[PDB]
Amino acid sequence: KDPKRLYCKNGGFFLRIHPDGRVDGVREKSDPHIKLQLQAEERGVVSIKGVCANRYLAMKEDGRLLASKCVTDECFFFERLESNNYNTYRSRKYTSWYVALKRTGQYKLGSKTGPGQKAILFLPMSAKS
């Protein structure tokens, strides 16, 4: 229902979405650019929206993460609650690729992701008006 924030296991960054479509991560939990709307577009599938940015998280055919004003099919991810109780966000289009952040706060390229990495593990937080 309410806005949330995606906390990454890799280093402790919040997934961030800039107004200009850029995606990155920050430790600052008050940065308004970390508020996200996860919409259940279907069972096991969510679209990830930056509230302030008014943009949708997206994954490109080359591994690139960016935020588009337009919702599209590169905008869907499978949300899965892993056995460790962290969530993972896997591209519904580019099926072996996950949303992830490097220990540097940069996002990690889709193509370099896979199961077992910290970079992929996130923990949603929040709820609120």
Residue type, 51: V
Query: Known binder of ligand: residue 87?
Result: no
State how far the Cα of 30 lies from the Cα of 95, in Å rounded to an integer.
Answer: 32
Contacts of range 15-18, beta carbons closer than 8 Å, 24 or more positions apart: 15/48, 15/57, 15/99, 15/101, 15/122, 16/50, 17/49, 17/50, 17/52, 17/53, 17/55, 17/57, 17/67, 18/50, 18/53, 18/55, 18/67
Domain ranges of the chain: 1-129
- Reduced DSSP (H G I as helix, E B as strand, rest coil) percent helix, strand, coil of the chain, to 5: 10, 40, 50
Out of 3.30.1370.10, 3.40.1180.10, 3.40.640.10, 2.80.10.50, select the CATH number for domain 1-129: 2.80.10.50
Reported structure resolution in angstroms: 2.0
